[PDB]
Automatic annotation (TrEMBL), chain A:
One of its GO terms (biological process) is glycolytic process. Belongs to the glyceraldehyde-3-phosphate dehydrogenase family. The gene is gap. It comes from Streptococcus agalactiae. It is an enzyme of class 1 (oxidoreductase). This is Glyceraldehyde-3-phosphate dehydrogenase.
TrEMBL record, chain B:
This is Glyceraldehyde-3-phosphate dehydrogenase. It comes from Streptococcus agalactiae. The record marks 178 as: Activates thiol group during catalysis. D-glyceraldehyde 3-phosphate binds at residues 150-152, 181, 211-212, 234. It holds the Pfam family Gp_dh_N. GO terms for biological process: glucose metabolic process; glycolytic process.
Length: 334, 334, 329, 319
């Protein structure tokens, strides 16, 4: 299956990197808003994720990656990308500006692509897939799908384990997040109207909103309407952590919650009892990584509050799932 | 006019000195650290996070002058061997962070010593801990050793007490997103305290850590003894922190009633704001805590409620403002 | 004199702050690309420079600052700003997009302003205050307050010339990161493969014209200096090193010479300060005696002199001084 | 075998490299803390990444891919019984960087009295020396760049400026510096901080023909690792292209070459001692007189450590 990337940014470029070690999926075209020399440089060198494991050499209208040429273009409007020229069936929409069924669908047309995977929430009329949590829902007939938020991919397997063992009454999330491209490097007008993302992202603790908690219902229906949360963006260029304080149906101890998470561990959901820090989870392939050292169960007058926390690298952790769901989606084509 | 001595001319020590200049009834006449006067004079005049000193500091022999008035300096490691009486100092600010107990702080009190001591940190349960404008009434003036509590307790106290005196709290879990501090390593190296996370580079990591402030709230507000607990997330900002508290309350509430309740409880120590500020905005403030209405949450799921309240504090200056207020009040009733 | 600001950014907002404590010049309109609520918030709160010393409350089409409504607009083209409506004679061009004779002149029009001062870099007089402020007569439509680095380098280099004379020199400025860098690795619209990189997590080399275009300020050094930059992770505050061949000198004569040249713009210090210490200062440049070097090897000499400056406030202080002087004449 | 005194940044990274070298093998570590602390700091590394292996803590040590390594906590090196594990020592504490105190058992991982850069003056060693030094991080960078300038064009005099990452000897926040330095007292990760550097003047001990001709200072900046060295010099000869070409010729395993516009993060964890950057080369000719500027990257941690291990390997060979 031949794939195209619209938006060769952080998620776009890292997705490309992971596609190299996945047989049966292959990127043959990239579309951004800049010349090929810029994109080749940004693939080779990466501040947070390290230099590229390969060779990248710039050509005309593209660059070669270990010998295979990949065409690049600078088409701003998705309608005008001739995806069909390079046989691209599926497009990774990673611009962050066409994160809806309506605007993503402008990739699908004559001389266009068949299907689209948005690298972000895509609205409620689009299927939202956290791999190894609800990828079963996919049948292969969907024109537009979404890989969810970075925070949802983290929160899902941790919350799902709580439900399938103890059941959850309600919960409040707090994610301590790395700063991202949508923040200003220094104090300046934010085009999105946010008075906090306007502030210097790398020199401040800056609060902000996140839909991941409320829109969990679309991934795990049994938790619909039960959660809500906010974010605190802090000065690290990548790597985040999600805290969840919840009330559970049953009564629990610290050891049963940790043990329950260990059982639920897989390729996406990790487990650790080492006292790691944010830099330790940079570039990991797990979507989320439960940290047993931070588990709390506070019993006061029979009532219990449970706190569970899990790490995730917003960049690579999410990208790992986006690629897994892309691989699975490409196979059941149709 | 009560004359004071500083043991430990560090972050809290130096800032305390700065604030004591604009308080008439108290005046510092001696400083004791582990270095020459030229080092301490430089660190008073120039301050990365808090700005240059508002005055003139010139180095003399065995001290330095501040706006004319000479202050003696010494380099005595043992508190027992400081001749505090030579400079008439009745009260000592213990800001080394090594003598934070009744027993070890008491080594300031002796012949050729001081009369009383204020520890700039938790000092144990056999020592009264004072959060100013929350429980300073408890003091009578006869106490040899007292404590100004933690930076986080001074923040959490007025926010939690307001919740109790309006709605009552069943239980609560705290999360503080804290600035990095001197007890962390600048880069990955052996921590003398045995902490495998404070061993890590403090300014390049989200680093989880423990905090007693939440549980030891009982010593400040007895009606909340044993009801709270929490953890910390140290993040790369050199000063400025924020405290989140998720709690279950006796009454039912709305967002507006909790904000309004905090506004009522506001004073010189407990601030209030509805502006969407960030961490740098609270650097060098005089309020102990500053409630942020924009971050308030009240989540109703199936009749049950969870309440989230958040407040800023500058671990350095916010705490120091209370430490000085408690010092002023204590000096008067001696 | 009534003034307007086009581009309420770092330099724009700080200029506004300093204009409050100068009587006889006064801002009556701001033009940017966003609503008034955004600009009011960014004036009140400032990460690097501290909270505003005043009161700001948002109204319609503007905000009040200690009283007196100040209009705000979101006009993209300079041609289409009706500056005359609010009586603004002079405009601060701080967008960083109209730094030329032709494009700055689109402020000067029938519905518009009389004159313009661009907040950056030859058809235009380039003025570093207390270094070549003489040059203005008051009849110039467009002028420029030079770069942040030029305002720093000028008084340090001029002192070297007026005492010892300069053969040639190479500059290295260790600069704070700025808004033209990417917060994270992404395509730079300007095509720079280094400002494309995460500005706050890298030492990033970059070019700087300030060194060569010294001739425009002080003709006596024209063509003899050149330099580059190293952008480093601090949100504001920079330092300029200059290694030069000059008479023969000692360390003490160079320091003493700089102290003599000190004034309101050119500072002097012998304290071992660091970048955070110079944040928000009013001096354009601040010579640091502790870093002076004079290396004599086989009769030949190399001289190294270093001076701090806060790209933001240091420069802004001069821009406002030049604006004040220009408004009078 | 080798033993490590000071399992810090340079100590631990040296250990890491020692795994991918046959004929050298570390069997003892001595620091000032328990084995559990050192095992954690080997497994996890903020700047250099997680350890490529398996680490499990035991009694008085920890196992690395099955083989136990002893650990001890002796402050005075005289009383470390190195002979117990057959060690024929990397002095990486930074407190015993002298003939007298290092001799008290050696390769010092830092700077007259002792031999001082692999592939630049490795010939000097014969194998009979009790005390030798791997030089500074900055010298290992500057040496192959300066040596190339001499062996092609010859240099009159030069002034160095190194933009350096912050290091463990700086304070995390403003506080009294043990060493009395009023600038390393300041918050290392929130400031441009000027500092002194011997590397430039003490180049004579590595390249004698340059003795007394160079000098420089440092600017410490907020990055946890990765540095760059600028050198402005006047040469004996009278273009940009010949200097770049000359460096390319001098390139080897230690001295790298690049014409890509990289930044500090790109050189983190590299094995080259120095990496010449052609994009930053300048030659300014004004009135017949010339000034030449040449710049080269180095990761103070791993770049230096790569040489320290290479010189350790070579030194072990000719014992
Ligand atoms: N960065 C993260 O941590 C993270 C995590 C989860 C998902 N995401 C999502 O991934 C997407 C990309 O985020 P990112 O961090 O990579 O952002 P980014 O800014 O790094 O990526 C944007 C890229 O798209 C390009 N672009 C912009 N407008 C375009 C247009 N009209 N047509 C084509 N290309 C255009 C940009 O030049 C750049 O190459 C967003 O939807 C974001 O929400 C990001
Ligand atoms: N930093 C904060 O935000 C904060 C907030 C509240 C409480 N505190 C408490 O304040 C105290 C000081 O913390 P800090 O951040 O100012 O630390 P710091 O490390 O900046 O201050 C310590 C100072 O004490 C000196 N010192 C060490 N041992 C000494 C001794 N035996 N005799 C004399 N001086 C000695 C050090 O040299 C240094 O000058 C600690 O108890 C800390 O827990 C700090
Ligand atoms: N940044 C510094 O420290 C510094 C130092 C020297 C000189 N300068 C120069 O000053 C200028 C301003 O740069 P800055 O650092 O303030 O950047 P900035 O990002 O703060 O300025 C950008 C501002 O201009 C506004 N803007 C953009 N396009 C506009 C348009 N068409 N119409 C109206 N407003 C528009 C933006 O919304 C924003 O408010 C640049 O030329 C810069 O080189 C600044
Ligand atoms: N990393 C660099 O930038 C760099 C550059 C070149 C060489 N070096 C040199 O290497 C040496 C180590 O520096 P580092 O960066 O690894 O520092 P570090 O602080 O990370 O390493 C110090 C280690 O030695 C231990 N130690 C201290 N005193 C000891 C004693 N008396 N006995 C035993 N162990 C003791 C410490 O606890 C710690 O484990 C210094 O001389 C330094 O100048 C480092
Ligand atoms: Mg492939
Ligand atoms: Mg006083
Ligand atoms: Mg005015
Ligand atoms: Mg080996």
């Amino acid at each position: 299956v031949k794939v195209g990337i619209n938006g060769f940014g952080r998620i776009g470029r890292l997705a490309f990197r992971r596609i190299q070690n996945v047989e049966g999926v292959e990127v043959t075209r990239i579309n951004d808003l800049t010349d090929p020399n810029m994109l080749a440089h940004l693939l080779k060198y990466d501040t947070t994720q390290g230099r590229f494991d390969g060779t990248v050499e710039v050509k005309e209208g593209g660059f070669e990656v270990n010998g295979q040429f990949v065409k690049v273009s600078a088409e701003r409007e998705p309608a005008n990308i001739d995806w069909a020229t390079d046989g691209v069936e599926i497009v990774l929409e990673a611009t962050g500006f066409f994160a809806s069924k309506e605007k993503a669908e402008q990739h699908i047309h004559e001389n266009g692509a068949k299907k689209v995977v948005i690298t972000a929430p895509g609205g409620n009329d689009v299927k939202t897939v956290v791999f190894n949590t609800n990828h079963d829902i996919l049948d292969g007939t969907e024109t537009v799908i979404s890989g969810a938020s970075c925070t949802t991919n983290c929160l899902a397997p941790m919350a799902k384990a709580l439900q399938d063992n103890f059941g959850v009454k309600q919960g409040l999330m707090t994610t301590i997040h790395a700063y991202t491209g949508d923040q200003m490097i220094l104090d300046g007008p934010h085009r999105g109207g946010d008075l906090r993302r306007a502030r210097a992202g790398a020199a401040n603790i800056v609060p902000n909103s996140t839909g991941a908690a409320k829109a969990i219902g679309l991934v795990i229906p049994e938790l619909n309407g039960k959660l809500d949360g906010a974010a605190q963006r802090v000065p690290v260029p990548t790597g985040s952590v999600t805290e969840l304080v919840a009330t559970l149906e049953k009564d629990v101890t610290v050891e049963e919650v940790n043990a329950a998470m260990k059982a639920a561990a897989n390729d996406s959901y990790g487990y650790t009892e080492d006292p790691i820090v944010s830099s330790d989870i940079v570039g990991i392939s797990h979507s989320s990584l439960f940290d047993a050292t931070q588990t709390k169960v506070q019993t006061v007058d029979g009532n219990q509050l449970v706190k569970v926390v899990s790490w995730y690298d917003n960049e690579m952790s999410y990208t790992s799932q986006l690629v897994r769901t892309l691989e699975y989606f490409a196979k059941i084509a149709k």
